[PDB]
């Protein structure tokens, strides 16, 4: 699930006619378009930061994994953080980060939470759900042995707990095999991470076409300011720059509107991801086909460059 | 009595918390401010000239011939049409956002107020008990009453009890030892009880379960012996 | 003084090593606040560290409860 | 099938598809 997009800002005058005095004087008579566009982009950026905060910063305390990592035969090594590498990410998280990779007044504001902080949040959520079940999401975290938690969940799906205790080794082996196959399935897939790549590519092409549209003439004798203002009289220079100004203003307005629509879609996706974090990871959901296909036992979150990956058991 | 007192204290503190918070009602205020700002910018943009010699019409039609008047008025016409179109598009986007919020509010009214929801962190933080609606100038306020456990204690636990060569599991609850004696308790509250045949069930022998311990399982019928 | 962050350069604030739950977001994990006397810059703290005592035969059970009322707008 | 995992509700002429079988009472053998 995608959670956010890149934060971008624009300089109105610099994009329009790159700090030109006569052009700026002619531009200040059009009203307050630039203020409106700047306000819209600022709102979009604040919304992106809020989306990330809402999805990831749900846990109250940073829970730490016990040093003796034995949980009754279950192996969480693929999803627990690896302290060898300086990134402190799980192998699955590193695979996700490796799988998806990649002016004229335009700029890119950095995100507020770094990737390391998001990884720390994911690690805290994993530690809480592994050492305390669902109790840490409703109040104080209460420790419980992991097989007893799994018996709780089997009772939750309508199977008696003894069925778990008489098949513990088989269930642990099946879980380990499935988690081992998850990484291979992610790696071998050609377009498993299609949504995040699509978001990145849409942002990139929007910026590229906005930059490229400057070369257009929009009916003027030339595209560059210098030729128009140099070899033509000011009375004709005014009307020749009017066309360029209005065309560039229209292009910038179009870019801002598409950005607003895309931001609304990303907000919907982030709300869905936050609901999934609340219900799949912090509890056990009885809703059908919500937390994966089958009878939901549990879920684990993993961070991605621009989103979340849920592992539904 | 304790539960009623706690509820009364929480309800009393709600009003003070609302009054003291500076940005508790932020969302409704932002909605109102955005609407007012859109109207203000729409009204103020009438003063722009858009390249014409003047922004007011009467001067344009007074001191200029009609052949130039038509082209001098077309600029104002197209600029004002552009402004109005921009206003309408922003209104459409904002209306879509407000509709999504209202759908969420209707779902919360149906599932939190008219029932008891088991969805985690939907009707507030904690185990949801019930909810109350309150009206607002442009929205709704939900008061979620929830249950929060407190004052935890550590215990030694076992998955099953081996008695007479057979394994016993708790019907509903956990086997808990206070150091010397074993009891059955409910998961969310500490209320120890004697492990009897009524609150346990038997399934198989006691050599398959990992971590099984030995203890006596009382049966109320045997002591009668009559 | 003058400080360099991944979000740019900050002038008029001093960088400290203590971390707080920040209130003014600057970016890239850097935040600022009023000390009270000067403006400081620091890195976020994501909450206190809590290592729950996990064991293979230990369970925590609550002995009391509270009831709470929460507002949503 | 015992009286411990079953409950009694009415006589056996209203339900459609009812069959005949013995329900084992775990008191009669021991009788305390």
Curated annotation (Swiss-Prot), chain D:
Glycan-bearing residues: 20
| UniProt function note | Subunit of the fusion protein that is processed upon entry into the host cell. Mediates fusion of the virion and cellular membranes by functioning as a class I viral fusion protein. Contains a viral fusion peptide that is unmasked after S2 cleavage. This cleavage can occur at the cell membrane by host TMPRSS2 or during endocytosis by host CSTL. In either case, this triggers an extensive and irreversible conformational change that leads to fusion of the viral envelope with the cellular cytoplasmic membrane, releasing viral genomic RNA into the host cell cytoplasm.
Q: Protein name, please? A: Spike protein S2'
**Upper taxonomic lineage:** Viruses, Riboviria, Orthornavirae, Pisuviricota, Pisoniviricetes
Recorded name of the encoding gene: S
């Amino acid at each position: 699930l995608p959670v956010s997009m890149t934060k971008t800002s624009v300089d109105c005058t610099m994009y329009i006619c790159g700090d030109s005095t006569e052009c700026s004087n002619l531009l200040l008579q059009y009203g307050s378009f630039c203020t409106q566009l700047k306000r819209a982009l600022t709102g979009i950026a604040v919304e992106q930061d809020k989306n990330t905060q809402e999805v990831f910063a749900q846990v109250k305390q940073i829970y730490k994994t016990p040093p003796i990592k034995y949980f009754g035969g279950f192996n969480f090594s693929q999803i627990l953080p690896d302290p060898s590498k300086p990134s402190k990410r799980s192998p699955i998280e590193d695979l996700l980060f490796n799988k998806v990779t990649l002016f004229n007044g335009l700029t890119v504001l950095p995100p507020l939470l770094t990737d390391e902080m998001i990884a720390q949040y994911t690690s805290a959520l994993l530690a809480g759900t592994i050492t305390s079940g669902w109790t840490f999401g409703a109040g104080p975290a209460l420790q419980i042995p992991f097989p007893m938690q799994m018996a709780y969940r089997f009772n939750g799906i309508g199977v008696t707990q003894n069925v778990l205790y008489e098949n513990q080794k088989l269930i642990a082996n099946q879980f380990n095999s499935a988690i081992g196959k998850i990484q291979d399935s992610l790696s071998s897939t050609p377009s498993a991470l299609g949504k995040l790549q699509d978001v990145v590519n849409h942002n990139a092409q929007a910026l590229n076409t906005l930059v490229k549209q400057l070369s257009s003439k929009f009916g003027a004798i030339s595209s560059v300011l210098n030729d128009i203002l140099s070899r033509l009289d000011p009375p004709e220079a005014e009307v020749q720059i009017d066309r360029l100004i209005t065309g560039r203003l229209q292009s910038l307005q179009t870019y801002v509107t598409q950005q607003l629509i895309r931001a609304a879609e990303i907000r919907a996706s982030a709300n869905l991801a936050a609901t999934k974090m609340s219900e799949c990871v912090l509890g056990q959901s009885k809703r059908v086909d919500f937390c994966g296909k089958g009878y939901h036992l549990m879920s684990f979150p993993q961070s991605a460059p621009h989103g979340v990956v849920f592992l539904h058991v | 009595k304790l539960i009623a007192n706690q509820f009364n204290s929480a309800i009393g503190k709600i009003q003070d918390s609302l009054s003291s918070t500076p940005s508790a009602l932020g969302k409704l205020q932002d909605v109102v401010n955005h609407n007012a700002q859109a109207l203000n910018t729409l009204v103020k943009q009438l003063s722009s000239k858009f390249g014409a010699i003047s922004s007011v019409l009467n001067d344009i039609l007074s001191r200029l011939d009609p052949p130039e008047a038509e082209v001098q008025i077309d600029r104002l016409i197209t600029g004002r049409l552009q402004s109005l179109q921009t206003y309408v598009t922003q209104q459409l986007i904002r209306a879509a956002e407000i509709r999504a919020s209202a759908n969420l509010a209707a779902t919360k009214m149906s599932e939190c107020v008219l029932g008891q929801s088991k969805r985690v962190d939907f009707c507030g933080k904690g185990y949801h008990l019930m909810s109350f609606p309150q009206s607002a100038p442009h929205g709704v306020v939900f008061l979620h009453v929830t249950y929060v456990p407190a004052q935890e204690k550590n215990f030694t636990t076992a998955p099953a009890i081996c008695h007479d060569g057979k394994a016993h599991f708790p019907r509903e609850g956990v086997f808990v030892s206070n150091g010397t004696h074993w009891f059955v308790t409910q998961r969310n509250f500490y209320e120890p009880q004697i492990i009897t045949t009524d609150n346990t069930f038997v399934s198989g022998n006691c050599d398959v379960v990992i971590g099984i311990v030995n203890n006596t399982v009382y049966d109320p019928l045997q002591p009668e012996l009559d | 003084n003058v400080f360099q962050t991944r979000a740019g350069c900050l002038i008029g604030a001093e960088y400290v090593n203590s971390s707080y739950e920040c209130d003014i977001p600057i970016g890239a994990g850097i935040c600022a606040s009023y000390q009270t006397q000067s403006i400081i810059a620091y890195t976020m703290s994501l909450g206190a560290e809590n290592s729950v005592a996990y064991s293979n035969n230990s369970i925590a059970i609550p002995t009391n409860f509270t009831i709470s009322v929460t507002t949503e707008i």
